[PDB]
Amino acid sequence: KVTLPPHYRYGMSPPGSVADKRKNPPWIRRRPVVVEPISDEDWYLFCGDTVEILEGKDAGKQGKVVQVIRQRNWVVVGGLNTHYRYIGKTMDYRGTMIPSEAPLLHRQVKLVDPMDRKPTEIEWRFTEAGERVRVSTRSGRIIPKPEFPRADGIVPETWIDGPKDTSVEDALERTYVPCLKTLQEEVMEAMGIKETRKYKKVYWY
């Protein structure tokens, strides 16, 4: 389960990983990082959103967010605000220098308007059907949430039922007839097991 301690410093690594355990040891006790309490209804930055970096290293470049961390209010864009690190380095082999992105706070990124590539301000407004969507305050532009890869990594279109996967028709076939009967009684009657000896009274205390 990897039960997090009361003060667990989140970082650019998934919890319960080899890197985290090399870091974040169970005996570590560091100063907590104060995080602005953005509510679930106030967080407007999602995965796949094209935001423009403000006040950051790029300060104007627009990129797609690749990872969100609501624990520390972090959104990381792809290929932007990068620093060079040697990965896979050995004693003699210097390693392949690659750019790794640094996390950015919510105040340091502003979502771009789909209508005009300039950044815009997000206001949560419910639609006629009750679907709360991100609306640009500049011109009332609806900003739909970009589609992100599914959590399990299974595309519904690109998925064929396996030998141990129940088909949709079999899973949706309703064969349950409600009745004032128990599972034990139903199984007994179905399998034909017959019992005639009654259960005598036992004192409960």
Binding site: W159, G162, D165, T166, A171, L172, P178, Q184, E185, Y199
Partner: protein, 124 residues
């Protein structure tokens, strides 16, 4: 000098202590003279395994199954699904009476039944 924090099991103590303690297995008989154990077949649990020939269900479900709303089953819902149609039919036909709820499906007392809802005298 004894570890109070450790769990007290059947591996600790003299022979009597080790023999008088169990790991939680339910008894299936009784002891008689000569330290002779008599086993009761009825006390021995009997597994009920159905026939899995032709059973179309599988351990996993395809991801193409559409999502459905979740509605936990309630007593009122069960009464509406099972007893309400018959009760309404009899009421409309005029054959309804307040004395044949047992006919409609009610159980006055759980006594005299192999499976009793309260107290539960049957296993899962």
């Amino acid at each position: 000098g004894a570890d109070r924090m450790s769990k007290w099991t059947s591996k600790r103590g003299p022979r009597s202590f080790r023999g008088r303690k169990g790991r939680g297995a339910k008894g299936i008989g009784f002891l008689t003279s000569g330290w002779r154990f008599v086993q009761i077949k009825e006390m021995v649990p009997e597994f009920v395994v159905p026939d899995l020939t032709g059973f179309k269900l599988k351990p996993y479900v395809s991801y193409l199954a559409p999502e459905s709303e979740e509605t936990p089953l309630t007593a009122a819902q069960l009464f509406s699904e099972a007893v309400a149609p018959a009760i309404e039919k009899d009421f409309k036909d005029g054959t309804f009476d307040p004395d044949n709820l047992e006919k409609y499906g009610f159980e006055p007392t759980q006594e005299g039944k192999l499976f009793q809802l309260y107290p539960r005298n049957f296993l899962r």
